[PDB]
């Protein structure tokens with residue numbers, strides 16, 4: 001660990017539920033390393049315990065076990081960020097790459113979880129009989145649940161149709177009437193997916209000949225921010241242990257280094273588990289094999 | 293009224309029941325023993341007649357409703373600026389022959405003075421004989437509940453009441469639903485607690501559904517018409 | 529055990545572990561694939577297990593030692609299931625003495 005902190009420029013290093021001094025001279029059976037970039041605006045949200053966006057939608061650090069945190073830096077001259085959305089249902093209906101800018105990281109602001117029956121599509125026959133505020137309708141693949149839209153009678157209007165998830169899933173008036181529900185990620189998994197605006201998904205007057213594709217503006221709940229500071233990028237890493245004083249993986253710092261030999265001087269040697277005393281003299285040999 | 297608790301006797305001593313054809317059809321509110329406030333759309337033709345009506349006061353239950361009630365029903369007064377296709381100025385005044393004697397559980401509500409600085413999200417009470425099912429069947433006891441006043445600029449959103457709210461119209465209830473009025477609550481008194489004094493600021497006009505989401509209540513703004521009410525005081 | 533080239537009907541499956549358990553010694557060694565024989569020496573002493581191996585007809589060389597603290601009792605050779613070892617197509621035989 002000393003060589004790791006020396007070679008890689010370490011800005012901060014702490015450990016929760018464990019002592020840093022106890023790491024020197026111990027053996028851990030396994031170590032899990034979770035690393036990701038640090039946003040400049042929301043860096044303070046990386047504290048141990050906070051109701052921030054990073055801990056509630058991107059990655060949460062469990063405090064019920066002994067772990068360690070390391071904030072380090074890296075020269076921003078050769079830093080590239082590969083963005084991806086770990087959402088299945090969002091990518092299924094036509095999600096693509098962000099392609100915003102370089103040296104920028106995207107953090108999710110809201111997380112929504114759905115079951116295996118949701119579809120950002122309304123019923124064509126139901127949406128056709130809506131002369132006022134007709135929602136867009138299209139066809140869904142085999143097996144889903146279309147948008148719940150009902151036509152309610154008014155004083156003079158008889159074609160006023162309402163739907164669910166209005167106006168937006170972030171500020172929905174009735175969350176219980178919408179299919180997608182806001183969920184909080186725990187420890188181990190990723191974000192379920194971004195928000196989906198049903199008003200911007202699909203086309204108008206579709207005779208079951210087009211899938212449910214949402215525009216790029218229909219996805220909400222994320223923000224991009226730069227990560228350049230003093231021509232460098234800050235990266236956070238979390239080391240999770242799996243056992244104390246048990247495991248083949250130990251610390252090499254608490255061992256005996258490989259010193260330099262000395263000729264024509266009486267020296268005490270500890271060569272290959274065999275101890276003794278004597279003088280060393282350099283000579284040319286050819287009878288030494290690989291294992292000998 | 294859906295999702296409301298039973299009203300104990302001597303709690304809302306201003307519930308006046310208007311019964312036509314020997315059955316209660318609409319409610320009302322009493323401010324003075326000579327005038328009763330009710331809905332104007334329910335008093336239209338051919339029901340716009342001085343006779344064929346009955347006023348009941350102090351009836352804590354529908355079981356006691358039988359032969360024998362208050363004074364005779366006089367002529368009805370409607371706002372000339374009211375319309376049928378467009379809901380506007382839905383206020384009606386009913387006159388009685390004999391004055392309403394103030395009994396033990398009888399207390400008229402006070403008219404709202406022009407200028408009160410009402411809270412935007414203020415808790416108010418709605419009491420009457422409503423329903424708790426699909427359009428209901430009848431109502432045998434008083435049902436009362438509490439609601440909130442939705443903002444005018446928020447209730448007329450493009451998804452609920454786009455261009456369907458007049459300056460003399462307010463919304464009471466919950467946006468999520470499950471608490472609202474239903475069919476049969478014509479003239480439901482909308483009273484609020486301000487400085488330990490109850491004020492009547494709303495009047496049931498119409499609605500969509502019963503205790504449903506995205507469909508708040510609809511009430512009339514009496515404060516605009518209060519002066520017109522005083523006009524009736526200048527008439528009789 | 530199955531063969532990589534000219535695979536059999538079934539698949540190689542001798543252990544079921546979702547994750548890698550705690551191992552004590554892991555290395556990789558090389559040998560000449562053109563040889564015709566291979567020699568192995570396995571034994572244990574004072575709870576320490578030694579290994580030796582050789583390619584040609586020569587005395588074996590050191591491979592490794594392992595400390596276990598327990599006396600092992602059984603060894604086994606997994607049969608090879610392949611579509612080429614059969615004498616119908618290649619006339620080859622497996623030998624492990």
Ligand SMILES: *[C@@H]1O[C@H](CO)[C@@H](O[C@@H]2O[C@H](CO)[C@@H](O)[C@H](O)[C@H]2NC(C)=O)[C@H](O)[C@H]1NC(C)=O
Nearest residue numbers: 530531532533540548551553554555556557558
């Ligand atoms: C010893 O060599 C074998 C064969 O090259 C290695 O097994 C491969 O390991 C890689 C990485 O885990 C896998 O992607 C391959 O599928 C494995 N191939 C086979 C045939 O198993 C093994 O990892 C090497 N051992 C060490 C310690 O390096």
Ligand SMILES: *[C@@H]1O[C@H](CO)[C@@H](O)[C@H](O)[C@H]1NC(C)=O
Nearest residue numbers: 263264265266267278279280
């Ligand atoms: C003895 O001394 C000489 C001269 O100082 C030196 O070169 C030599 O290495 C020494 N030998 C030992 C065994 O110390």
